[PDB]
């Protein structure tokens, strides 16, 4: 059901970036690009370390938007508990 997680992630990221980008006084493409978003949902991980390696990511960007991304990624993450031992 990976597609479900990715689809949901992108869907939420669209509204989040839309509201934040609209209020901030900019455009969605001015804050994030199709490629950046694609990789974001594709990776699906709170760890901002791996995200920083994604073209179009900065401390300020992740600090403003990334915050919500990490919160949700950490919330849903707690629900899952794959055997990593």
Tokens of 49: 């370390």
Question: Which residue ranges make up the annotated binding site?
Answer: 33
Closest CA relative to residue 19, chosen from 10, 28, 11: 28
Q: What are the CA-CA distances from residue 46 to residues 25, 27, 30, 41 (Å)?
A: 26, 24, 23, 11
Question: Which residue ranges make up the annotated binding site for ATP?
Answer: 33
Long-range contact pairs involving 39-46 (C-beta distance under 8 Å, separation at least 24): 40/9, 40/13, 40/69, 41/6, 41/9, 41/10, 41/13, 42/6, 44/5, 44/6, 44/9, 44/73, 45/73, 46/70, 46/73, 46/74, 46/77
Method: NMR
Phi and psi (nearest 5°) for 13?
A: -65, -30
Q: Hey, what domains does the chain have and what are their CATH numbers?
A: 1-79 (1.10.150.80)
């Amino acid at each position: 059901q990976r597609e479900e997680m990715v689809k949901k992630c992108l869907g939420e990221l669209t509204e989040v970036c839309k509201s934040l980008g609209k209020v901030f006084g900019v455009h969605y493409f001015n804050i994030f690009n199709t490629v950046t978003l694609k990789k974001l949902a594709e990776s699906l991980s709170s760890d901002p370390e791996v995200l920083l390696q994604i073209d179009g990511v900065t401390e300020d960007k992740l600090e403003k938007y990334g915050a919500e991304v990490i919160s949700v990624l950490q919330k849903y993450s707690e629900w899952t508990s794959p055997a990593e031992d």
